[PDB]
Design a protein around this nucleic acid. Structure first.
Length: 64
RNA sequence: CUUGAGUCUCGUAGAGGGGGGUAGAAUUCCAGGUGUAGCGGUGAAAUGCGUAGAGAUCUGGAGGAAUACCGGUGGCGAAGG
Protein backbone atom coordinates (compact mmCIF):
# COMPACT_ATOMS: atom_id res chain seq x y z
CA UNK A 1 0.00 0.00 0.00
CA UNK A 2 0.89 3.52 -1.07
CA UNK A 3 -0.74 6.68 0.28
CA UNK A 4 -4.38 6.90 -0.95
CA UNK A 5 -5.79 8.56 -4.09
CA UNK A 6 -6.91 12.24 -4.29
CA UNK A 7 -10.39 11.25 -5.67
CA UNK A 8 -12.01 7.81 -5.21
CA UNK A 9 -10.96 4.81 -7.34
CA UNK A 10 -13.97 2.76 -6.06
CA UNK A 11 -17.67 2.79 -5.07
CA UNK A 12 -19.40 0.51 -2.57
CA UNK A 13 -22.50 -0.64 -4.55
CA UNK A 14 -23.06 -1.15 -8.32
CA UNK A 15 -26.76 -2.09 -8.65
CA UNK A 16 -26.78 -0.36 -12.12
CA UNK A 17 -30.53 0.36 -12.33
CA UNK A 18 -33.38 2.19 -10.55
CA UNK A 19 -36.42 4.43 -11.06
CA UNK A 20 -36.57 8.19 -10.69
CA UNK A 21 -40.01 8.89 -9.25
CA UNK A 22 -41.13 12.50 -9.57
CA UNK A 23 -44.06 14.05 -7.74
CA UNK A 24 -44.45 17.27 -9.71
CA UNK A 25 -46.87 18.87 -7.23
CA UNK A 26 -49.14 21.95 -7.53
CA UNK A 27 -46.82 23.99 -5.23
CA UNK A 28 -43.50 22.01 -5.56
CA UNK A 29 -41.56 19.22 -7.24
CA UNK A 30 -39.98 16.30 -5.37
CA UNK A 31 -37.55 13.87 -7.01
CA UNK A 32 -36.51 10.55 -5.42
CA UNK A 33 -34.43 7.73 -6.96
CA UNK A 34 -35.50 4.31 -5.71
CA UNK A 35 -34.16 0.80 -6.37
CA UNK A 36 -36.34 -1.39 -8.65
CA UNK A 37 -38.36 -2.74 -5.62
CA UNK A 38 -39.28 0.87 -4.62
CA UNK A 39 -37.11 1.28 -1.51
CA UNK A 40 -35.88 4.87 -1.82
CA UNK A 41 -32.10 5.40 -1.90
CA UNK A 42 -31.95 9.22 -1.86
CA UNK A 43 -34.05 12.27 -2.71
CA UNK A 44 -34.03 16.05 -3.16
CA UNK A 45 -36.46 18.87 -3.91
CA UNK A 46 -37.41 22.13 -5.57
CA UNK A 47 -38.36 23.84 -2.25
CA UNK A 48 -35.16 22.92 -0.35
CA UNK A 49 -33.19 24.78 -3.12
CA UNK A 50 -34.04 28.17 -1.44
CA UNK A 51 -37.60 28.40 -2.94
CA UNK A 52 -41.03 28.96 -1.29
CA UNK A 53 -44.39 27.73 -2.76
CA UNK A 54 -44.24 30.65 -5.23
CA UNK A 55 -40.97 29.53 -6.99
CA UNK A 56 -40.54 25.84 -5.99
CA UNK A 57 -43.55 25.01 -8.24
CA UNK A 58 -41.68 25.88 -11.52
CA UNK A 59 -39.93 23.58 -14.06
CA UNK A 60 -36.67 25.53 -13.31
CA UNK A 61 -36.88 24.68 -9.58
CA UNK A 62 -37.76 21.09 -10.58
CA UNK A 63 -34.77 21.06 -13.03
CA UNK A 64 -32.53 21.64 -9.95
C1' C B 1 -122.76 4.57 -32.95
C1' U B 2 -117.30 4.70 -32.87
C1' U B 3 -114.70 8.48 -34.58
C1' G B 4 -113.55 11.30 -28.60
C1' A B 5 -112.50 8.41 -24.60
C1' G B 6 -111.65 3.68 -22.34
C1' U B 7 -109.48 -1.78 -22.11
C1' C B 8 -106.43 -6.13 -22.64
C1' U B 9 -103.42 -9.02 -25.55
C1' C B 10 -98.86 -8.50 -28.02
C1' G B 11 -93.93 -6.12 -30.25
C1' U B 12 -90.41 -2.66 -27.66
C1' A B 13 -86.79 1.52 -26.13
C1' G B 14 -85.46 3.80 -21.90
C1' A B 15 -80.07 7.85 -16.74
C1' G B 16 -88.37 6.83 -14.74
C1' G B 17 -89.48 5.13 -9.35
C1' G B 18 -89.14 2.17 -4.57
C1' G B 19 -86.76 -1.70 -1.71
C1' G B 20 -82.30 -4.38 -1.09
C1' G B 21 -77.58 -5.98 -2.89
C1' U B 22 -72.50 -4.91 -5.40
C1' A B 23 -67.33 -3.92 -8.11
C1' G B 24 -63.47 -1.56 -9.31
C1' A B 25 -61.34 2.82 -9.13
C1' A B 26 -60.39 7.20 -6.92
C1' U B 27 -60.15 11.89 -3.28
C1' U B 28 -58.38 11.08 1.96
C1' C B 29 -55.63 9.19 6.05
C1' C B 30 -51.90 6.25 9.08
C1' A B 31 -47.81 2.99 10.17
C1' G B 32 -43.51 0.84 9.07
C1' G B 33 -39.38 -0.63 5.73
C1' U B 34 -36.02 2.23 2.39
C1' G B 35 -34.47 7.03 2.79
C1' U B 36 -33.03 11.78 5.07
C1' A B 37 -34.74 17.06 6.16
C1' G B 38 -37.33 18.42 4.15
C1' C B 39 -42.95 18.79 3.29
C1' G B 40 -46.94 22.42 2.34
C1' G B 41 -49.31 27.56 0.33
C1' U B 42 -50.29 32.31 -2.42
C1' G B 43 -51.04 37.70 -5.55
C1' A B 44 -47.39 37.55 -0.83
C1' A B 45 -46.79 34.00 2.09
C1' A B 46 -48.15 33.40 6.73
C1' U B 47 -51.33 30.21 8.89
C1' G B 48 -50.36 24.86 8.30
C1' C B 49 -47.07 19.77 7.92
C1' G B 50 -41.49 17.95 9.83
C1' U B 51 -36.69 16.63 11.74
C1' A B 52 -39.62 13.57 18.50
C1' G B 53 -38.08 10.50 11.62
C1' A B 54 -42.11 13.45 7.85
C1' G B 55 -42.78 14.65 2.42
C1' A B 56 -41.23 11.12 -1.55
C1' U B 57 -40.86 5.99 -2.89
C1' C B 58 -42.40 0.51 -1.75
C1' U B 59 -45.35 -2.67 0.90
C1' G B 60 -49.43 -3.48 4.88
C1' G B 61 -53.84 -1.33 7.04
C1' A B 62 -58.34 2.25 7.78
C1' G B 63 -62.98 5.27 6.35
C1' G B 64 -66.98 7.60 4.12
C1' A B 65 -68.87 9.70 -0.31
C1' A B 66 -69.40 9.26 -5.91
C1' U B 67 -69.56 6.83 -10.60
C1' A B 68 -64.68 9.13 -15.51
C1' C B 69 -65.20 7.25 -20.59
C1' C B 70 -69.88 6.22 -23.27
C1' G B 71 -73.09 10.88 -24.66
C1' G B 72 -76.65 12.28 -28.74
C1' U B 73 -81.02 19.35 -28.92
C1' G B 74 -80.63 11.37 -27.32
C1' G B 75 -83.80 8.34 -23.91
C1' C B 76 -86.69 8.43 -19.59
C1' G B 77 -89.64 11.14 -15.25
C1' A B 78 -95.87 13.32 -12.01
C1' A B 79 -92.98 17.48 -11.42
C1' G B 80 -88.67 18.23 -8.43
C1' G B 81 -85.49 15.61 -11.51
Amino acid sequence: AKAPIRARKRVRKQVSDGVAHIHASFNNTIVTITDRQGNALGWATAGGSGFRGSRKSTPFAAQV
